[PDB]
Amino acid sequence: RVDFPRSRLRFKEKLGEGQFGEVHLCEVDSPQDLVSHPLLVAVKILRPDATKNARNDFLKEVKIMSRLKDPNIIRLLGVCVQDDPLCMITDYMENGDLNQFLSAHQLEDKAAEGAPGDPTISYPMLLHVAAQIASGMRYLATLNFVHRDLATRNCLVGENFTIKIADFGMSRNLYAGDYYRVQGRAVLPIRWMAWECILMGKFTTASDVWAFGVTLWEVLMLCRAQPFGQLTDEQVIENAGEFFRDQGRQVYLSRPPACPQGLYELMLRCWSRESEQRPPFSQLHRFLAE
Ligand SMILES: Nc1ncc(Oc2cccc(CCNC(=O)c3cccc(OC(F)(F)F)c3)c2)cn1
């Protein structure tokens, strides 16, 4: 297995920067360097002073991505692992992450004539978006692959509302509020987590389905609110306990203004107390893509 030629990566702009690296947008001329006119790629590079643990994390991140080959999953274009600055190369998704994208749009209304504010997105397009997410998750489930951090902040939008699922980890300061963190413990996206995940700390496909229910809720909110937004983290964790008790005191996310009751009731099924009663992704995908 040979390296992608880093000299073929022409820098365009720093796209982002993190604790152990930077992310660059680069152009690749004549991209017959890959088995799968300039190509736009995103590049993740480990900062030179990267500690030994960070480097190991990088190499493992790269191994994990090599598995993923699906239209609605992010794909690893190539890597630079043999020499000093370590790189991961992937497709540039020109419309950024799904959370920021939806935050910039308003809901379409064909019964009205109004002054042009933000760009619109129709209810059918929101479903097209959700369906693709379900298709990606469906593929991961056939790999018995567990995501563990599904949310709009981890989806990417390309041309023509094509969506891919990804995982940026949990260190980007923009979304630091979507994660609960206690010294000595693992970092947790509790507002997206199923109750048994919060209490017992183990993740499964059944729990991915829960998080998908929350991500769908985000999409239909046009990402205007954080889930359980008026609740503190302690309260959100307590609520998981209330699911465990099962005495009718657990609370759910409310129906979004856009959202038809039927679509909502689908979100409810994703939040069943019992794992095995939550719909499979295949069944989700079939509902949304109809
Ligand atoms: N605009 C734009 N376009 C593209 C772009 O790309 C990235 C740039 C920098 C870094 C990453 C993170 C890559 N690593 C993963 O995505 C990953 C890791 C582990 C598991 C994993 O599982 C999953 F695929 F199922 F999710 C995924 C993506 C960013 N911005």
Residue 21 is assigned to a ligand binding site: yes
Tell me the C-alpha distance between 258 and 218, whole Å: 11
Q: Is 172 in the pocket of ligand 1 (CB under 6 A)?
A: no
Residue 18 is assigned to a ligand binding site: yes
Q: Is 167 in the pocket of ligand 1 (CB under 6 A)?
A: yes
Residue 248 is assigned to a ligand binding site: no
Is position 149 annotated as part of the catalytic site?
Answer: yes
- C-alpha distances in angstroms, 100 versus 20, 96, 153, 157, 213? 23, 7, 8, 10, 19
Domain ranges of the chain: 1-92, 93-290
Q: Return phi, psi of residue 55, to 5°.
A: -60, -40
CB-count exposure of residue 221 (10 Å: 0-12, 13-18, 19+): buried
Q: List the catalytic residue out of 57, 83, 91, 149.
A: 149
Minimum CA distance residue for ligand 1 atom 11: 168
Q: Give the mutation target among 17, 92, 167 for probing the ligand 1 site: most ligand atoms within 8 A of CB.
A: 167
The β-bridge partners of 91 are 41
Atom of ligand 1 nearest to the CA of 93: 3
Among the listed residues 181, 282, 177, the one whose alpha carbon sits nearest the alpha carbon of residue 225: 177
Residue type, 201: G
Beta-carbon contacts of 110 under 8 Å, excluding residues fewer than 6 positions away, are none
The reported resolution of this PDB entry, expressed in Å, is 2.2
